Scaffold this active site. Structure first.
Site, PDB file in Angstrom:
ATOM      1  N   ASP B  32       0.818  -1.213   0.000  1.00 41.20           N
ATOM      2  CA  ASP B  32       0.000   0.000   0.000  1.00 41.20           C
ATOM      3  C   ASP B  32       0.849   1.261   0.000  1.00 41.20           C
ATOM      4  O   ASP B  32       1.953   1.235  -0.557  1.00 41.20           O
ATOM      5  CB  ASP B  32      -0.886  -0.131   1.256  1.00 41.20           C
ATOM      6  CG  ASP B  32      -2.226   0.548   1.184  1.00 41.20           C
ATOM      7  OD1 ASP B  32      -2.245   1.790   1.032  1.00 41.20           O
ATOM      8  OD2 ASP B  32      -3.276  -0.115   1.305  1.00 41.20           O
ATOM      9  N   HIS B  64      -3.776   6.184   3.684  1.00 38.83           N
ATOM     10  CA  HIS B  64      -4.513   4.942   3.417  1.00 38.83           C
ATOM     11  C   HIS B  64      -3.840   3.692   3.930  1.00 38.83           C
ATOM     12  O   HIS B  64      -4.510   2.851   4.572  1.00 38.83           O
ATOM     13  CB  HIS B  64      -4.744   4.878   1.904  1.00 38.83           C
ATOM     14  CG  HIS B  64      -5.498   3.701   1.376  1.00 38.83           C
ATOM     15  ND1 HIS B  64      -4.873   2.522   1.045  1.00 38.83           N
ATOM     16  CD2 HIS B  64      -6.808   3.535   1.075  1.00 38.83           C
ATOM     17  CE1 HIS B  64      -5.780   1.672   0.577  1.00 38.83           C
ATOM     18  NE2 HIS B  64      -6.962   2.260   0.575  1.00 38.83           N
ATOM     19  N   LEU B  75      -2.895  -2.478  17.815  1.00 38.26           N
ATOM     20  CA  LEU B  75      -2.528  -3.165  19.039  1.00 38.26           C
ATOM     21  C   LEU B  75      -3.626  -3.287  20.070  1.00 38.26           C
ATOM     22  O   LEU B  75      -4.450  -2.395  20.164  1.00 38.26           O
ATOM     23  CB  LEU B  75      -1.330  -2.461  19.713  1.00 38.26           C
ATOM     24  CG  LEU B  75      -0.063  -2.423  18.846  1.00 38.26           C
ATOM     25  CD1 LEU B  75       0.990  -1.555  19.526  1.00 38.26           C
ATOM     26  CD2 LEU B  75       0.459  -3.821  18.592  1.00 38.26           C
ATOM     27  N   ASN B  77      -4.647  -2.800  23.578  1.00 42.46           N
ATOM     28  CA  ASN B  77      -4.156  -2.038  24.732  1.00 42.46           C
ATOM     29  C   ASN B  77      -5.243  -1.104  25.231  1.00 42.46           C
ATOM     30  O   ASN B  77      -6.431  -1.425  25.079  1.00 42.46           O
ATOM     31  CB  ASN B  77      -2.844  -1.329  24.334  1.00 42.46           C
ATOM     32  CG  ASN B  77      -3.013  -0.486  23.092  1.00 42.46           C
ATOM     33  OD1 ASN B  77      -4.136  -0.093  22.797  1.00 42.46           O
ATOM     34  ND2 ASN B  77      -1.975  -0.169  22.326  1.00 42.46           N
ATOM     35  N   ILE B  79      -5.667   2.244  24.320  1.00 43.91           N
ATOM     36  CA  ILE B  79      -5.820   3.414  23.471  1.00 43.91           C
ATOM     37  C   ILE B  79      -6.398   3.054  22.112  1.00 43.91           C
ATOM     38  O   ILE B  79      -6.367   1.886  21.751  1.00 43.91           O
ATOM     39  CB  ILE B  79      -4.471   4.134  23.201  1.00 43.91           C
ATOM     40  CG1 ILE B  79      -3.454   3.180  22.581  1.00 43.91           C
ATOM     41  CG2 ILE B  79      -3.930   4.762  24.488  1.00 43.91           C
ATOM     42  CD1 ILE B  79      -2.221   3.843  21.974  1.00 43.91           C
ATOM     43  N   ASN B 155     -14.399  -0.533  -6.206  1.00 46.52           N
ATOM     44  CA  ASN B 155     -15.510   0.337  -5.861  1.00 46.52           C
ATOM     45  C   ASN B 155     -16.220   0.837  -7.131  1.00 46.52           C
ATOM     46  O   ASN B 155     -16.669   1.990  -7.173  1.00 46.52           O
ATOM     47  CB  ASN B 155     -15.037   1.538  -5.046  1.00 46.52           C
ATOM     48  CG  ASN B 155     -14.282   1.169  -3.774  1.00 46.52           C
ATOM     49  OD1 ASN B 155     -14.489   0.111  -3.175  1.00 46.52           O
ATOM     50  ND2 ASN B 155     -13.420   2.108  -3.407  1.00 46.52           N
ATOM     51  N   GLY B 169      -7.843  -8.055  -7.919  1.00 46.32           N
ATOM     52  CA  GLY B 169      -8.973  -8.783  -7.352  1.00 46.32           C
ATOM     53  C   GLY B 169      -9.635  -9.750  -8.320  1.00 46.32           C
ATOM     54  O   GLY B 169     -10.082 -10.833  -7.929  1.00 46.32           O
ATOM     55  N   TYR B 171      -8.392 -11.755 -10.499  1.00 46.04           N
ATOM     56  CA  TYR B 171      -7.700 -13.012 -10.786  1.00 46.04           C
ATOM     57  C   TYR B 171      -8.167 -14.098  -9.839  1.00 46.04           C
ATOM     58  O   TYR B 171      -8.257 -13.861  -8.628  1.00 46.04           O
ATOM     59  CB  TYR B 171      -6.181 -12.808 -10.692  1.00 46.04           C
ATOM     60  CG  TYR B 171      -5.645 -11.843 -11.730  1.00 46.04           C
ATOM     61  CD1 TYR B 171      -5.874 -12.033 -13.081  1.00 46.04           C
ATOM     62  CD2 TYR B 171      -4.900 -10.729 -11.342  1.00 46.04           C
ATOM     63  CE1 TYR B 171      -5.371 -11.154 -14.036  1.00 46.04           C
ATOM     64  CE2 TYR B 171      -4.386  -9.857 -12.275  1.00 46.04           C
ATOM     65  CZ  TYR B 171      -4.641 -10.067 -13.616  1.00 46.04           C
ATOM     66  OH  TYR B 171      -4.125  -9.198 -14.559  1.00 46.04           O
ATOM     67  N   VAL B 174      -6.554 -14.797  -6.352  1.00 45.43           N
ATOM     68  CA  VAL B 174      -6.733 -13.818  -5.286  1.00 45.43           C
ATOM     69  C   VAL B 174      -8.106 -13.938  -4.641  1.00 45.43           C
ATOM     70  O   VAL B 174      -9.060 -14.302  -5.316  1.00 45.43           O
ATOM     71  CB  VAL B 174      -6.588 -12.418  -5.927  1.00 45.43           C
ATOM     72  CG1 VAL B 174      -6.860 -11.284  -4.959  1.00 45.43           C
ATOM     73  CG2 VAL B 174      -5.196 -12.241  -6.551  1.00 45.43           C
ATOM     74  N   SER B 221     -11.255  -1.220   0.127  1.00 50.22           N
ATOM     75  CA  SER B 221      -9.960  -1.180   0.785  1.00 50.22           C
ATOM     76  C   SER B 221     -10.060  -1.487   2.283  1.00 50.22           C
ATOM     77  O   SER B 221      -9.071  -1.980   2.849  1.00 50.22           O
ATOM     78  CB  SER B 221      -9.377   0.249   0.779  1.00 50.22           C
ATOM     79  OG  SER B 221      -8.642   0.475  -0.402  1.00 50.22           O
TER      80      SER B 221
HETATM   81 CA   LIG Z   1      -5.421  -0.168  20.613  1.00 49.81          CA
END
Ligand SMILES: [Ca+2]
Lengths: 63, 281
Positions: B32, B64, B75, B77, B79, B155, B169, B171, B174, B221
């Site tokens: 990306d 993006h 993660l 956690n 936050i 899209n 996408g 193929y 995939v 996406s």
């Molecule tokens: Ca987090």
């Protein structure tokens, strides 16, 4: 209005003028035709893909 | 305080986390626009750039790739948000520059890097309207090397009875992913066609943004990384399953939705996929 087939072949300046008249808040970005792009969907964006003469190469469409 | 995006719960990812399966030691390449490795809610294991003018893969000048990466692995956690596979080994394979575009050769180069660096899963939240023999060869080579390859379906909405699935996408090697909302309704922008494989949440998806920020985006996406993360959860429970078995477990345990042309097999359910007993692979 969300698609502009009448602009294929126009210069970037000409295309931007028409799109902004039709969609005042359009977020226009110019890229080379034949590229890969991000797949997020932005209703205010209009990508303009251009050829080697810098003319619109594909039908502009929102997204 | 941490908020779990609706889509992560919708595909049943926290069920696997509660059993101790979080994608640990599974290598996922996010091919990306780069990943902001400084985000407090992300841990990037490595990366590489194929964008000539942007050598640093850990600087995302678009936003993006960081958002896609947070859906795969933000993660767990106290936050921000929570990724589908929060312990995955996340790799930033930058093939798109600040403007969100890249040459086909840069995408192929990133796929080749991913294969060479033994990635288990590839996520491609990107596409174009035309294919190429070289692009097809690259995704086919990755799958032949054992990698699970996932991509946004596109899209492009609908176009009569024709396929609007874009490339890579389109193929068959995939897994092409379409977008649904929190009510399992296909988003009007989601591409359709025989090549559409599965659906995942892709409307108003909250994730990480560069500079210690968070925000919502829409698109196929956003749906793709739910499936790439789901593949990493499955591999963390079943490390000996082949990519063929991971793919069949996701496609054959979906929650059936509408017609296949518009919804593929339906909505992925990673809890069901991880409990799947194979009879054909
Ligand atoms: Ca987090």
């Amino acid at each position: 209005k969300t698609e502009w087939p009448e602009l294929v072949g126009k210069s970037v300046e000409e295309a931007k003028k028409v799109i902004l008249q039709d969609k005042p808040a359009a977020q226009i970005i110019v890229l080379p035709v034949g590229t890969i792009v991000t797949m997020e969907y932005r209703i205010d964006r209009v990508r303009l893909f251009v050829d080697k003469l810098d003319n619109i190469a594909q039908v502009p469409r929102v997204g | 305080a941490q908020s779990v995006p609706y889509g992560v719960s919708q595909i049943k990812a926290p069920a696997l986390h509660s059993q101790g399966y979080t994608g640990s030691n599974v290598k996922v390449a996010v091919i990306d626009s780069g990943i902001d490795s400084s985000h407090p809610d992300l841990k990037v294991a490595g990366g590489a750039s194929m964008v000539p003018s942007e050598t640093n893969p850990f600087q995302d000048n678009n936003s993006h790739g960081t958002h896609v990466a947070g859906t795969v692995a933000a993660l767990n956690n106290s936050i921000g948000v929570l990724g589908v596979a929060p312990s995955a080994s996340l790799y930033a394979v930058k093939v798109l520059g600040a403007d969100g575009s890249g040459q086909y050769s840069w995408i192929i180069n990133g796929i080749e890097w991913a294969i060479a660096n033994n990635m288990d899963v590839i996520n491609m939240s990107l596409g174009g309207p035309s294919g190429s023999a070289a692009l097809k060869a690259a995704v086919d080579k990755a799958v032949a090397s054992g990698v699970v390859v996932v991509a946004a379906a596109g899209n492009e909405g609908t176009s009569g009875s024709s396929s609007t699935v874009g490339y890579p996408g389109k193929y068959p090697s995939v897994i092409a992913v379409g977008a649904v909302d929190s009510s399992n309704q296909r988003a009007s922008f989601s591409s359709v066609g025989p090549e559409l494989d599965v659906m995942a949440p892709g409307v108003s998806i909250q994730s990480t943004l560069p500079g210690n920020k968070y925000g919502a985006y829409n698109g196929t996406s956003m749906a793709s990384p739910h499936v790439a993360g789901a593949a990493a959860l499955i591999l963390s429970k079943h490390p000996n399953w082949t990519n063929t078995q991971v793919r069949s477990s996701l496609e054959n345990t979906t929650t059936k939705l509408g017609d296949s042309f518009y919804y593929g097999k339906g909505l992925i359910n990673v809890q069901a996929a991880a409990q799947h007993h194979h009879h054909h692979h």
